[PDB]
Design an enzyme around this catalytic site. Sequence first.
Site, PDB file in Angstrom:
ATOM      1  N   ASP A 167       0.838  -1.204   0.000  1.00  0.00           N
ATOM      2  CA  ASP A 167       0.000   0.000   0.000  1.00  0.00           C
ATOM      3  C   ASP A 167       0.868   1.248   0.000  1.00  0.00           C
ATOM      4  OD1 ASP A 167      -1.417  -2.204   1.163  1.00  0.00           O
ATOM      5  OD2 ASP A 167      -2.630  -0.860   2.409  1.00  0.00           O
ATOM      6  N   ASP A 224      -0.915  -3.086  -4.142  1.00  0.00           N
ATOM      7  CA  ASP A 224      -2.070  -3.011  -3.251  1.00  0.00           C
ATOM      8  C   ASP A 224      -2.660  -1.611  -3.378  1.00  0.00           C
ATOM      9  OD1 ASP A 224      -3.950  -3.437  -0.980  1.00  0.00           O
ATOM     10  OD2 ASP A 224      -2.753  -5.206  -0.570  1.00  0.00           O
ATOM     11  N   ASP A 225      -3.449  -1.197  -2.392  1.00  0.00           N
ATOM     12  CA  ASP A 225      -4.165   0.067  -2.499  1.00  0.00           C
ATOM     13  C   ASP A 225      -3.217   1.229  -2.762  1.00  0.00           C
ATOM     14  OD1 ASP A 225      -6.864  -0.703  -2.165  1.00  0.00           O
ATOM     15  OD2 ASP A 225      -6.497  -0.988  -0.001  1.00  0.00           O
ATOM     16  N   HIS A 251      -4.371  -1.986  -6.183  1.00  0.00           N
ATOM     17  CA  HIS A 251      -5.750  -2.387  -5.938  1.00  0.00           C
ATOM     18  C   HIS A 251      -6.721  -1.214  -5.932  1.00  0.00           C
ATOM     19  CE1 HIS A 251      -4.500  -6.514  -4.006  1.00  0.00           C
ATOM     20  NE2 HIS A 251      -4.029  -6.341  -5.228  1.00  0.00           N
ATOM     21  N   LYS A 276     -14.691  -0.288   0.870  1.00  0.00           N
ATOM     22  CA  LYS A 276     -14.793  -1.589   1.528  1.00  0.00           C
ATOM     23  C   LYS A 276     -15.056  -1.379   3.011  1.00  0.00           C
ATOM     24  CE  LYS A 276      -9.700  -1.831   0.935  1.00  0.00           C
ATOM     25  NZ  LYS A 276      -8.465  -2.661   1.017  1.00  0.00           N
TER      26      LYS A 276
END
Length: 336
Positions: free
Chosen positions: A154, A175-176, A197, A232
């Site tokens: 991230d 990832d994010d 992501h 999320k």
Amino acid sequence: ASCTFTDAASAMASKTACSTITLNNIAVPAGTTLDLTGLTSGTRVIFEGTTTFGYQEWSGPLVSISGTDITVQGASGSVLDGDGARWWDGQGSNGGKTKPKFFYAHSLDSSSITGITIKNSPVQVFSIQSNNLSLTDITVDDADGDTQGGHNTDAFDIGSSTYITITNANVHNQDDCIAVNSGENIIFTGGTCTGGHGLSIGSVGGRSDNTVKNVTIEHSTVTNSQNGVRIKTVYGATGSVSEVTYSNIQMSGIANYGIVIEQDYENGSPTGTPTNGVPITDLTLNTVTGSVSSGATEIYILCGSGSCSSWTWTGVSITGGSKSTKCENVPSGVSC
Ligand SMILES: *[C@@H]1O[C@H](CO)[C@@H](O)[C@H](O)[C@H]1NC(C)=O
Ligand SMILES: *[C@H]1O[C@H](CO)[C@@H](O)[C@H](O)[C@@H]1O
């Protein structure tokens, strides 16, 4: 007074006696933090050359800075090189080797970070828990992680924060690009996110702070990523997400979901059944456009009963892939 350090021990011993601290080509000892916490208000910190880190299985952080009215800068050509392939094993923070988080900005308040380049982080990069902190012209170069086992890399993880502004970030990771776990009055603008992501609110829930309010993610591009825009919220958790705006977002090459908003999230795998303890209210999507890959789903909304309300979606146009057959509790004025 101005001080230039070529080793971490000298910098740590003398940091409060210097109002400008230059960190030149420092090799940070294995298993230790380059600990620049507790700075005197007003201090300027300059990273020069290549900062490196010894190898050890531990949780980090590799670097930590704190204080009020601190100005952190990367000099032209400077890099903080984590050489993360020494740890990468495809498992990130979910298994395998214990891997150190990169950069803590905890209580780095009324402060700024500008022009820092991070290369090959072992795992997550910035952990932000501050008030009135700007991060400008940040580069996360984790592209090697695409083929060498990077995971959970991230770029910007935010919690328990207010007045965070991220401008002109350039991220290539796994990832994010941003993950807002909690916080209020947060701006991410002008970003380019690839490999990861997506631009995420959350996960929200299951922590001490589960409140997200007044976040704008805008004027940004997400490419070659699992998701484009994502919210999320944790299955069975309690919290709230309100006054979030995604505006002027472009995406392409999205593998799984162009836009995904789901209230069944778990770190291992979502449950498929949403819950309603983390309401998402006053969500605006304005001009969120682009394309997804042939095997992707354009828009997926999995809301619990009563926990998604008062949304405004305008100028949303996601092409490619397929339409979802699985959306639940879609609010008025919104469609998958
Ligand atoms: C929302 O956040 C932005 C940026 O942090 C700020 O400029 C704005 O005043 C905030 N709005 C409210 C109502 O606090
Ligand atoms: C840190 O740096 C100062 C000089 O800025 C030294 O006096 C101190 O002993 C430590 O090396």
